[PDB]
Design a protein around this ligand. Structure first.
Ligand SMILES: Nc1ncnc2c1ncn2[C@@H]1O[C@H](COP(=O)(O)OP(=O)(O)OC[C@H]2O[C@H](O)[C@H](O)[C@@H]2O)[C@@H](O)[C@H]1O
Ligand SMILES: [Cl-]
Ligand SMILES: [Cl-]
Ligand SMILES: [Cl-]
Ligand SMILES: [Cl-]
Ligand SMILES: [Cl-]
Lengths: 76, 75, 74, 75
């Protein structure tokens, strides 16, 4: 949905699974400074103070972004 | 609770109930141009293209806003 | 990019070009408030409550900041 | 207010004041992209993907726009 992480291999921003997006976005809305999530057993932490995702198995750091919708909304 | 409506009587922005905030925020995230909700004995439409809430019983209009959290977050 | 709500017309209204520039400059500088005048009336915008206040009467009208989509559409 | 991500250090990095101003001026004017130079390096920032492209090598560096809280907090 609205969070993305950048894949350096493909050179593209990528969406999370619905479940992981909801876990991240819920922690964002609750004021937490970081959040843990998994893809299967693979562990990750998103650090909101640096906007980086840390792969907790390889240590690789990928940037994250929060997409923003226009305000006000455009007419259809 | 990230949506707010302005109360001209008190001069303050006000929160929605958790459930009404969720209805509004779910329609916002889904790309809808407006959303209806019920609070007490009144039905309201939030018009996202104008950022105004309309009381459908009386026609009264109140402005709305979406709060935004800082990016990046502070330590 | 800044607007104030006019309850008489029931609509958000744009600020004048100069008032918009004055308000947006203070916003970007991290200030908590900014002064301006319109129609020979003195106002303060309070960014911590997102309202404009008539300094003589105390009347509060809400303000909003338009936001651009991120990413941008093609 | 604009930042680019450095995959070597794993950190977001600031632009020079002049390059930040070039990027932000194009952002505010509705452009879909903007070119800038830093020394011998030549880049395009693509706002539709939030990526900076090195015009010589094609290397992609993600970019971000910092966002100030609304409403603002008291000091
Ligand atoms: N940003 C603005 N830009 C242009 N016009 C504005 C703005 N803000 C308000 N106005 C207009 O400014 C006018 C006043 O709104 P207000 O400054 O809030 O103060 P009050 O409501 O206590 O009215 C104060 C006195 O003015 C009258 O004679 C009344 O009888 C009062 O005696 C409205 O027309 C607004 O649309
Ligand atoms: Cl990268
Ligand atoms: Cl990895
Ligand atoms: Cl009402
Ligand atoms: Cl004005
Ligand atoms: Cl590069």
């Amino acid at each position: 949905n609205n969070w993305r992480w950048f894949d350096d291999r493909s050179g593209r921003w990528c969406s999370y699974s619905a479940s992981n997006n909801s876990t991240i976005d819920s922690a964002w809305k609750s004021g937490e400074t970081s959040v843990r999530f998994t893809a299967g057993r693979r562990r990750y932490t998103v650090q909101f103070t640096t906007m980086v995702q840390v792969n907790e198995e390889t240590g690789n750091r990928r940037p994250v972004m929060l997409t923003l919708l226009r305000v006000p909304r455009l007419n259809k």
